[PDB]
Design an enzyme around this catalytic site. Sequence first.
Site, mmCIF file in Angstrom:
data_model
loop_
_atom_site.group_PDB
_atom_site.id
_atom_site.type_symbol
_atom_site.label_atom_id
_atom_site.label_comp_id
_atom_site.label_asym_id
_atom_site.label_seq_id
_atom_site.Cartn_x
_atom_site.Cartn_y
_atom_site.Cartn_z
ATOM 1 N N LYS B 77 5.106 -7.574 4.772
ATOM 2 C CA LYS B 77 5.558 -6.259 4.342
ATOM 3 C C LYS B 77 6.953 -5.988 4.903
ATOM 4 O O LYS B 77 7.341 -6.530 5.926
ATOM 5 C CB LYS B 77 4.506 -5.255 4.798
ATOM 6 C CG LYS B 77 4.427 -3.935 4.072
ATOM 7 C CD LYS B 77 3.114 -3.248 4.438
ATOM 8 C CE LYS B 77 2.882 -2.022 3.653
ATOM 9 N NZ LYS B 77 1.463 -1.865 3.303
ATOM 10 N N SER B 118 2.675 -7.373 -1.205
ATOM 11 C CA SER B 118 1.875 -8.504 -0.759
ATOM 12 C C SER B 118 0.882 -8.934 -1.850
ATOM 13 O O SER B 118 0.877 -10.096 -2.232
ATOM 14 C CB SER B 118 1.133 -8.182 0.520
ATOM 15 O OG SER B 118 1.941 -7.573 1.510
ATOM 16 N N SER B 138 -3.841 0.441 2.077
ATOM 17 C CA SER B 138 -2.702 -0.342 1.625
ATOM 18 C C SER B 138 -2.965 -1.829 1.659
ATOM 19 O O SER B 138 -2.246 -2.560 1.006
ATOM 20 C CB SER B 138 -1.480 -0.056 2.388
ATOM 21 O OG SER B 138 -0.817 1.078 1.885
#
Lengths: 372, 371
Positions: B77, B118, B138
């Site tokens: 990330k 991702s 997330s």
Amino acid sequence: AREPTALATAAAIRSGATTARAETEAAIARIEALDGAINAVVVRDFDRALAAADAADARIQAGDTAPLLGVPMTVKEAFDVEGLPTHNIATSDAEAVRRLKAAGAIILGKTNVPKGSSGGSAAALASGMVPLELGSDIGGSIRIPAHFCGVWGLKPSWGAISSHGHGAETPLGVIGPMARSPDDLAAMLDLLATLPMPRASRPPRRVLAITDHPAIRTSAVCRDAVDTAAEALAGAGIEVIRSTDLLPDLARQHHAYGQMLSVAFARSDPTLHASLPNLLTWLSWQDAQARNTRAWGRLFGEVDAVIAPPAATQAFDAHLAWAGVATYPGLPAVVVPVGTANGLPVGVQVITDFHRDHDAIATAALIHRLTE
Amino acid sequence: MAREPTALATAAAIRSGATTARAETEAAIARIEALDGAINAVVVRDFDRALAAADAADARIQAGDTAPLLGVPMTVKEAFDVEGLPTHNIATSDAEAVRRLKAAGAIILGKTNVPGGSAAALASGMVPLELGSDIGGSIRIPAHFCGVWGLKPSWGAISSHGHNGAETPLGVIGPMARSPDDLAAMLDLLATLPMPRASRPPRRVLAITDHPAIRTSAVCRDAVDTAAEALAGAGIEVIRSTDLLPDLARQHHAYGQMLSVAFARSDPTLHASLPNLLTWLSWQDAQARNTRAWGRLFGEVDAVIAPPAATQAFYDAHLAWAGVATYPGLPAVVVPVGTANGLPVGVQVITDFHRDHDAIATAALIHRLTE
């Protein structure tokens, strides 16, 4: 192992290496993987596709030589496919769809319209979901998504391909294939064309390379790609020129593209009906367009192709400037990937004379071999 | 899809001489440069230093190094600091979890979005390994959406220094990949202290489909029921209710309140709705009591399978399914269990505090029995 091409998928099935049914299921699995990520295939027809695959295999068992038999593919949402909506449920295939099915292809679903990268045909292709797709192009929708995503596209000579189903033929607009190999473009052109287009071939001997256009600035990277392709051809014994007196004024040509485009993108905007020319003016424009087409014919007496940028920028009415060079005269135009710069695909558009489509494909194949 | 090789298989390939770290990274780069004009995940590239990292990684291979992910290309990330790259602000040292991945031999090509992601980078096959964060879904919810695997670890298991000073309550960092084996290897590299190994298959599992706070799409429920059937048919007791299940409605509220604090510490406008200190401490004591209630449940059942979210792919009540674990600090794995309507559909498996490997293990079992 980058994914097999449409003809290699065809060969695989024909040769018994796989079945149409394993090929369509694999496509579906590939769509179901990425679709929560690319979101290209807005309309699915998997159940009838899976039966199509079974019909297609039975035909393989009884010696059918259809050239794309069992190959899974997709089409723009703007083409009618019998049973699917076109948003309005359609009761018959578009002509270019009837030809693809006749030739044995299996329509899994339909992709977006490129509401800059796409999420459409071009995405579906670069992502490897299917090896074959069919778009349209009035202002770049084939050639510019293909630039952006690193796939190939053919904008044919105008009128080469029925667009019934996508009704007079619409001036400037065309329908064309998109795929990942030149061989597929050719096979697809050869399936779709109303009449057989010239082989017309032999390798090119003089090519014209343009980088700039009076109406937009053109990104260094987009210019570089042309200059790369120019060097690869120069270094293979081919005369490359940068300019000729025969090149039609591109600034005026743009204006003419503007005017004509309006008419179309205005026939369906009731308020702006009163900015339409009178009939005599309109016909003056078609006669003007034909004069341009014959000027481009004069250029193609000196050079065998023209290589240009497909657009001003990479991904992410003057972005139309590079599309119009060919769309206006009705010239055939191929976009071919020639590298990457700044993380992003970078292509070139090859343009040849009216009805020299195969040569376009051929000359784009030459450019691609000499750079990759 | 000639589905792409796993991170451990890429590791084996390199170790065994079948390929080089440098051929692996070049391949990744080519794959990013192919799809990136299409999916647009990798917003930060470091390809040239990645290519030198690959050369450092090969030299270690020539002197007999058995580091477990040596030469494997991966991404992180944008929210993790990587020495040299920006974090939007150029960062002067790696985040802790990045120092560990490099030590363990991995090659950080670049950094992905915050919500593609991702999850996109993975489902697209660009790289076999990636590292996200998750305070309200997330990790687990992009993975659901895209058909990849994600581990939200037990809280505090993994330093998130570098992702503000103290570890942030509720928040974690975790790996994402395409196989359970990779999750484990990565957890075991990242964890500050070694987490308990998975020491037996589950015998009783609790399957939840509904949550007092949101409606849950039939499809999302179906996926649980699919996972329940696969386990039921392997001699495993699957139950739909127990009195030991902590009240999920109240738990949600508590998640609400606590989440605010964090997502408000640096938002001036909301500062006046912050609790007093004694209130805050009332909340932490409440959170610890919840964690021990979940421990009581995990005396009866060995896992809990739930939806990771309310819907498939393509507002603080889409967080209802994330909170079941994020609030108690429980470990949670999301595993793909099929497709419906053209789109991936997953399940989240939850186990007791520090039973992360078991979570991975039980998710592996569910996946094998449904594919």
